[PDB]
């Protein structure tokens, strides 16, 4: 509802690399085959609006296509996008520091299947007991998978659900932005 402080902000694109940053955020999209989000470092999740004046490539954008929620200071930018993933309103935003990228969580695998569960709250790869969940899946996402990294463990994007639908103690995000 409010706008972020534009005194500590810096957005720059040069050659094949684009970066929307400030003191807490470092949002990097790269041109490889296509322009897409490569890595987002969120030192501490904000709750403001990223100013359009410091936004690259923000023409005709549907907010539901933006990986990082605009309400969480996500830039209204086509750089803030990734094929196969809608907006991550239910990511682990209440874990403090969070780092999004596109790679596999250690010991885990992600498979494409229409059988897989529909997108839900972001689930951590380790249970409350600390047991690792190895088999994951998705219906219509792309690989490598959307991965969160917080101080409490490694998470997957909303689209990605545990393949063994039968997990007992799941650690899932409780926030909805």
């Amino acid at each position: 509802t409010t706008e972020c402080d534009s005194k500590i902000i810096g957005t720059a694109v040069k050659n094949n690399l684009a970066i929307h940053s400030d003191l807490s955020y470092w949002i990097e999209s790269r041109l490889n085959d296509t322009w897409k989000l490569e890595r987002a470092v969120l030192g501490e999740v904000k709750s403001c609006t990223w100013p359009e004046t410091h936004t690259l490539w923000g023409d005709g954008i549907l907010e539901s296509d933006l990986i990082i929620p605009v309400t969480l200071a996500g830039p209204r930018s086509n750089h803030n996008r990734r094929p196969g993933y809608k907006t991550q309103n239910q990511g682990p935003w209440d874990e403090g520091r969070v780092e999004i990228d596109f790679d596999y969580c250690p010991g885990t695998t992600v498979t494409l299947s229409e059988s897989c569960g529909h997108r839900g709250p972001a689930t951590r790869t380790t249970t409350e007991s600390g047991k690792l969940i190895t088999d994951w899946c998705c219906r219509s996402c792309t690989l490598p998978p959307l991965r969160y990294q917080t101080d409490s463990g490694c998470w997957y994007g909303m689209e990605i659900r545990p393949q063994r639908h039968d997990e007992k103690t799941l650690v899932q995000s409780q926030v909805n932005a």
Partner: protein
Amino acid sequence: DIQMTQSPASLSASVGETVTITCRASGNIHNYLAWYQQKQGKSPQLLVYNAKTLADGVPSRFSASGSGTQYSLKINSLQPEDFGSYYCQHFWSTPRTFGGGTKLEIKRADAAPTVSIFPPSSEQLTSGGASVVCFLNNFYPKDINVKWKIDGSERQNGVLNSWTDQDSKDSTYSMSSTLTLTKDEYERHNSYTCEATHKTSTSPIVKSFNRNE
């Protein structure tokens, strides 16, 4: 915004033949494109998403590709099933827009129409109206001419025609012609005839009856 221009607007092709339909966007949509199939009167079915990814249950004879502003849906070994309209839609920017569409004809054997004629029902006659119905079933190609003759003289007004879509199995067509008269006008004459002129023959396929019989 992003405008989707689809081509060809219409296309006719035989079973087993390879067809390719193209979709062009006014701006680069970055492989955020879906192909749908719809045949009236059902709802559209997702064929392709992400430009090159087939949806679940879509046969191997379907393929799709392209990048930038140019995309293509290719059907190899065309089947009678694959008749109907094909649409392309982008998921890149807002608003979402669709292609104009491409109706797919299954080109097939030429077929003479099966003609049936039907006098007014006693109920309609009780109501004071009198409709004579002519059914032209299972023919190809789609274009066909229906001529109504009352006592030998052509009647043009009061005729209502209606074609069906191409059949899902034999790829043929069927049309219904309804000549609506008043009861008095119907009783004014005797012989009623429907003649079907089709590509298959210059000789009209004729069905007829007499009122007082």
